């Protein structure tokens, strides 16, 4: 890397790793459109395997950015509309509280307080129907935002129904393959297990457990190289050849709702740039009133676009600023505090613009 990039990255990440006791970390900086990679520490402490540019990390909720783009692509194809009732794609969902809950609401956590987690006991398609039928909203649709796996997860599942494909097949065919994300997985193949880092929680090596709607809400594993390519694709969508995918990316960065200084996209979240980390900023459940952006603002180039992600053993962060052709991916195999991620990312990106 140019020495400037080398120095801000190392001076920022070295202390972060020390303070947070992160076993292993990979960072990509995208600068004037080109990626620069950095790796530290261990993918597997016991087996002494280092983090490399080929190490797979669990993305946790950063997976939602893929879900939102896949949904965007289905809208662009004319397969779904965000204005469609949920029941159009799941007629079996007959309980009256679903009246007026649209795919938009599912995608943006505004359906009226869907649960943060799908219960462990919900496994099968029948279990899932029962779970959503029995759910009682606290609020009318489109009034409050409650970050929730069960909301965006359902959006992902329904968005692919008209395609005829499984969620994984749709993601692979329509997003991963066209963008050459060839080491990005919903299910890690045996051939790739050698690269799959362990997560560390309280010193114990852990991987994410199977759960209903996992693929859709939190189930992607990827390398720093593929994640850099994902950032490039989101920085410059109109340079993607596949037309509906280009559109899908743009739709995911549209601003649908405002909460304070933040705007909710499909998976992505955005703030106007410039912005300080204290505004970008441990809470299990955070209910916030939302203001509709009527109609949604198309992707604003002058944005800080980002997403944090966590699983039991991993902590990820992605942020980019389209107007500056600047971005960063930070992947770690410990779930360490979000403010520490945003602070480090801001320190690096602010130094480079």
Curated annotation (Swiss-Prot):
Something else known:
The class C beta-lactamase family has a specific amino-acid numbering system known as SANC, for structural alignment-based numbering of class C beta-lactamases, or else the simpler name structural position. A multiple sequence alignment was used to derive a consensus sequence and then the consensus was numbered taking into account insertions and deletions. This allows use of identical numbers, e.g. for active site residues, despite differences in protein length.
Q: What is the effect of changing residue 216 to K?
A: Increases activity about 150-fold with respect to cefotaxime. Reduces activity about 5-fold with respect to cephalothin. Reduces thermodynamic stability
Query: Protein name, please?
Result: Beta-lactamase
Upregulation: Can be induced by beta-lactams. Expression is not up-regulated by the non-beta-lactam inhibitor, benzo(b)thiophene-2-boronic acid (BZBTH2B).
Activity regulation statement: Inhibited by the beta-lactamase-blocking agents avibactam, enmetazobactam, relebactam, nacubactam, vaborbactam, taniborbactam, zidebactam, and beta-lactam-analog boronic acids, via a covalent binding to Ser-61. Inhibited by non-beta-lactam, benzo(b)thiophene-2-boronic acid (BZBTH2B) and various cyclic boronates. Not inhibited by clavulanic acid. Inhibited by O-aryloxycarbonyl hydroxamates, via cross-linking of the active site Ser-61 to Lys-307. Weakly inhibited by citric acid.
Give yes or no: UniProt keyword Flavoprotein. no
What changing residue 307 to A does, per the record, is:
Lowers activity more than 1000-fold
Q: Could you list this entry's UniProt keywords, alphabetically sorted.
A: Antibiotic resistance, Hydrolase, Periplasm, Signal
Record-level GO cellular component terms:
outer membrane-bounded periplasmic space
Relate the outcome reported for changing residue 290 to E: Increases activity about 100-fold with respect to cefotaxime. Reduces activity about 5-fold with respect to cephalothin. Reduces thermodynamic stability
UniProt GO MF annotations: beta-lactamase activity
Query: What is catalyzed by this enzyme?
Result: a beta-lactam + H2O = a substituted beta-amino acid
Family under the similarity heading: Belongs to the class-C beta-lactamase family.
The protein's organism comes out as: Escherichia coli (strain K12)
Quaternary form?
A: Monomer.
Query: What compartments host this protein?
Result: Periplasm
In the UniProt entry, which residues are flagged as the active site?
Answer: 61
Q: What is the effect of changing residue 149 to A?
A: Lowers activity more than 6000-fold
Residues bound to a beta-lactam: 61, 117, 147, 149, 310, 335
Superkingdom field:
Bacteria
Assigned EC number? 3.5.2.6
Q: Give the PROSITE patterns listed for this entry.
A: BETA_LACTAMASE_C
**Coiled coil regions in record:** none
What InterPro entries does this protein's entry cite?
Bact_CellWall_Synth/Modif (IPR050491), Beta-lactam-related (IPR001466), Beta-lactam/transpept-like (IPR012338), Beta-lactam_class-C_AS (IPR001586)
Q: Which GO terms describe its biological process?
A: antibiotic catabolic process; response to antibiotic
Function, in words: Class C beta-lactamase which confers resistance to penicillins and cephalosporins. Has benzylpenicillin- and cephaloridine-hydrolyzing activity. Has weak cefuroxime, cefotaxime, cefoxitin and oxacillin-hydrolyzing activities.
């Amino acid at each position: 890397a140019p020495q400037q990039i080398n120095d801000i990255v190392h001076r920022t990440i070295t202390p972060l790793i020390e303070q947070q006791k992160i076993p292993g970390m990979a960072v990509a900086v995208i600068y004037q459109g080109k990626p620069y990679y950095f790796t530290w520490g261990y993918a597997d402490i016991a087996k002494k395997q280092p983090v490399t540019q080929q190490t797979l990390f669990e993305l946790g909720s950063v997976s939602r950015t893929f879900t939102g783009v896949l949904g965007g692509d289905a809208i662009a194809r004319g397969e779904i509309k965000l204005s469609d009732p949920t029941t159009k794609y799941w007629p079996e969902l007959t309980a009256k509280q679903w009246n007026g809950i649209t795919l938009l609401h599912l995608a943006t956590y505004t359906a009226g307080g869907l649960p943060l987690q799908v219960p462990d006991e919900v496994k099968s398609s029948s279990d899932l129907l029962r779970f959503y039928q029995n759910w009682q909203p606290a609020w009318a649709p489109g009034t409050q935002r409650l970050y929730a796996n069960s909301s965006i997860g359902l959006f992902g599942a329904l968005a692919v129904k008209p395609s005829g494909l499984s969620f994984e097949q749709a993601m692979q065919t329509r997003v991963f393959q066209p963008l050459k994300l060839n080491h990005t997985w919903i299910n890690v193949p045996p051939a790739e297990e050698k690269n799959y880092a362990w997560g560390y929680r309280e010193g114990k090596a852990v991987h994410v457990s199977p759960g209903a709607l996992d693929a859709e809400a939190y189930g992607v594993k990827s390398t720093i190289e593929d994640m850099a390519r994902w950032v490039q694709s989101n920085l410059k969508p109109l340079d993607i050849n596949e037309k509906t995918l280009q559109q899908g990316i743009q739709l995911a960065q549209s601003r649908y709702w405002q909460t304070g200084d933040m705007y909710q996209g499909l998976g992505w979240e955005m703030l106007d740039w410039p912005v300080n980390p204290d505004s970008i900023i441990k809470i299990a459940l955070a209910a916030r009133p939302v203001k509709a952006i009527t109609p949604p603002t198309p992707a604003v180039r002058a944005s800080w676009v980002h997403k944090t992600g966590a699983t039991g053993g991993f902590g990820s962060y992605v942020a980019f600023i389209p107007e500056k052709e600047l971005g960063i991916v930070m992947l770690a195999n410990k779930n360490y505090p979000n403010p520490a991620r945003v602070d480090a990312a801001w320190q690096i990106l602010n130094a480079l613009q």
